[PDB]
């Protein structure tokens, strides 16, 4: 139904192996490529979202819509009930339940610090945004465990993986 | 049919002690289920003494047939129904037949023997776990609740109690590595911390268990000479090196939650609540 900003893609003869979806190989397909275009056609990077960032964004947008619908005058159940559509209500309920029951960072400032650490780091300047989201989401504790769960980080050995993991564990609220 | 029933059952041939325990458990299960039938039979045929004893004997014989001799239900009903009915004579010496069981009861026998064969492995696993614990003093609660253990829920309660009160020992025995977080790590830290003596001083565990089992006061819970906040703060100040807590209120909350966990993992409270709910509970929607 909804159409992406990427169009064309007409017939050719060559066939490529970087077309199939694969998280381990970091092949996310054309619609999830590293380079995207906005409504103005300017350069844009793929925007991944960790569960903390996703929860913050969904809560902010939902509460903004709820405030707007009431003339600009917190509960997840009420917030889900704000939306229209029984199937939409169920889907947003399930997403909210997942995010709440696996929220590593429920505070705006903790998520901001985590994003700053995972973005401004010299080692992380090469890290793929999908890798960053996976690291902030799965909450791994060990370099070996992270490498096993994320095969992409195995080839990136120029990363201070263990100390970054310890920093995330520190930032994680016990 | 028996092969299909026993396909999931890896170990079927029980020992003689296990066999007798299975027979007793099956008899008790039938008595619980057929309580109305047994009561009506006893009330109507009150003249005959120990009709239910003959019922237990017949149930034991039927279980013997099905297990040892591998007899299907219709064969038993067509050629061994003499055991299933007790012919007594009244005051007039008229031969009166008493249908103690029906074919549906034989199907119930098969289902119950399968159920006990299933739970036998679980009870053996709990016994092996307890033996691996190798307690210096045999826990009276363990013995008391294991002797009366009939349902797998009670076995799970035993497992929870043993794991909670021997979390360090159980973790060591597991060690005797996937970094799974032990849910009892906080309680182990409390045990290692200097505030654990305060938790002892709240109430004696053995005295609490004796009082609860007796259902009446055998000992009086002695109140410590200083308030919980007083003792917590004093120990925190005198053991700042070892007290992992930050504030006295945090230690107070940790002590309260540890006491709540201790009370929750007590098998007797769970058993009493379960009996009360099963007896007098209601259903609301």
């Amino acid at each position: 139904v909804s159409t992406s900003t990427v169009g064309a893609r007409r017939r050719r003869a060559k066939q490529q192996v970087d077309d199939e979806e694969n998280a381990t190989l970091l092949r996310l397909g054309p619609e999830f490529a590293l380079k995207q275009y906005d409504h103005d056609g300017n350069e844009h990077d793929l925007i991944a979202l960790s569960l903390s960032e996703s929860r913050l964004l969904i809560r902010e947008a939902l509460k903004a819509r709820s405030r707007a619908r009431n003339g600009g005058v917190i509960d997840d159940d009420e917030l889900a009930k704000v939306t229209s559509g029984a199937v939409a209500n169920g889907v947003v309920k399930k997403t909210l339940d997942y995010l709440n029951t696996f929220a590593r960072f429920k505070d705006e400032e903790t998520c901001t610090a985590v994003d700053q650490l995972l973005h401004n780091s010299s080692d992380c300047s090469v890290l793929h945004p999908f890798e960053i989201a996976q690291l902030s989401s799965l909450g791994c504790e060990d370099v070996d465990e992270a490498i096993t769960l994320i095969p992409s980080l195995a080839a990136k050995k120029e990363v201070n993986l263990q100390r970054i993991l310890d920093e995330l564990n520190r930032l994680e609220d016990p | 049919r028996f092969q299909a029933y026993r396909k999931s059952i890896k170990n079927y041939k029980l020992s003689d002690v296990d066999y007798s325990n299975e027979r007793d458990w099956i008899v008790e299960q039938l008595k619980l289920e057929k309580r109305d039938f047994l009561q009506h039979l006893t009330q109507a045929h009150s003249s005959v003494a120990h009709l239910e004893e003959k019922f237990e004997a017949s149930v034991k014989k039927i279980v013997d047939f099905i297990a040892i001799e591998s007899f299907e239900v219709p064969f038993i009903w067509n050629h061994r129904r003499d055991y299933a009915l007790h012919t007594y004579n009244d005051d007039s010496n008229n031969t009166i037949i008493v249908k103690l069981l029906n074919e549906d009861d034989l199907w119930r026998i098969v289902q119950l023997d399968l159920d006990y064969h299933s739970i036998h492995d679980k009870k053996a696993a709990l016994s092996s776990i307890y033996k691996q614990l190798d307690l210096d003093v045999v826990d009276p609660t363990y013995e008391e609740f294991f002797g009366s253990a009939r349902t797998l829920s009670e076995l799970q309660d035993i497992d929870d109690y043993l794991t909670f009160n021997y979390s360090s020992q159980v973790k060591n025995l597991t060690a005797v590595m996937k970094r799974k977080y032990s849910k009892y790590a906080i309680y182990d830290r409390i045990r290692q911390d200097a505030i654990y003596p305060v938790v002892q001083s709240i109430a004696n565990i053995s005295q609490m268990r004796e009082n609860l089992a007796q259902s009446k006061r055998l000992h009086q819970v002695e109140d410590p000479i200083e308030s919980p906040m007083d003792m917590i703060a004093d120990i925190m100040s005198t053991e700042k090196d070892k007290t992992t807590f930050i504030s006295s209120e945090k230690a107070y909350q940790a002590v309260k939650q540890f006491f709540s966990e201790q009370l929750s993992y007590e098998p007797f409270i769970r058993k009493t609540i379960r009996t009360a709910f099963q007896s007098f509970g209601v259903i609301n929607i």
Partner: protein, 171 residues
């Protein structure tokens, strides 16, 4: 995995709605028709950012049918699983053929052939579960699984998980 995407929708409006409240009505129609839907190409659209300030542009009158056609561009949060990805889950059902878990709106089915052998299914347990000596996974239990395959339907996505590798199973 969650993402931010710039999506576009074609909205057709009947002439009976050609009133002053046309723009707001288009906004709520877009919200009702996009929020919660499931497209195989993108996955699941969960929310639309800035839902009350979306530009709709000028609608074009379809020749011969009167209805106006609007091109609506918006930014939305989208979740889509990928092959070979390890995510958290909550078990929703236990069955002899396998157990069903839930990863947000997606329901994932894991067959016994993708489960470690020591986690023998126990139907006698209450509730029935796939349990081992040190592991017990039942309804409501947190599980860490790796998505192996995804099946595309008309407006649904079916994923298959596995716990047979390391750092998987119960968590």
């Amino acid at each position: 995995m969650f993402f931010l995407k710039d999506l576009s929708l074609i909205l057709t409006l009947h002439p009976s709605y050609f009133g002053p409240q046309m723009n707001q009505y288009l906004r709520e129609k877009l919200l009702t028709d996009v929020e919660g839907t499931c497209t195989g190409q993108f996955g699941y659209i969960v929310t639309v950012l800035d839902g009350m300030n979306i530009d709709v542009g000028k609608g074009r009158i379809i020749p011969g049918s009167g209805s106006a056609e609007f091109e609506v561009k918006y930014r939305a949060v989208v979740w889509k699983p990928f092959k070979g990805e390890v995510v958290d889950a909550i078990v929703s059902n236990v069955s002899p053929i396998g157990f069903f878990a839930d990863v947000g709106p997606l329901n994932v089915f894991v067959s016994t052939r993708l489960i470690p052998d020591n986690l023998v299914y126990n139907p006698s347990n209450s509730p029935p579960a796939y349990m081992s000596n040190d592991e017990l996974i039942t309804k409501g239990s947190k599980v860490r699984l790796k998505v192996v395959g995804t099946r595309t339907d008309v407006n649904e996505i079916y994923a298959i998980g596995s716990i047979k590798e390391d750092f998987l199973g119960a968590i």
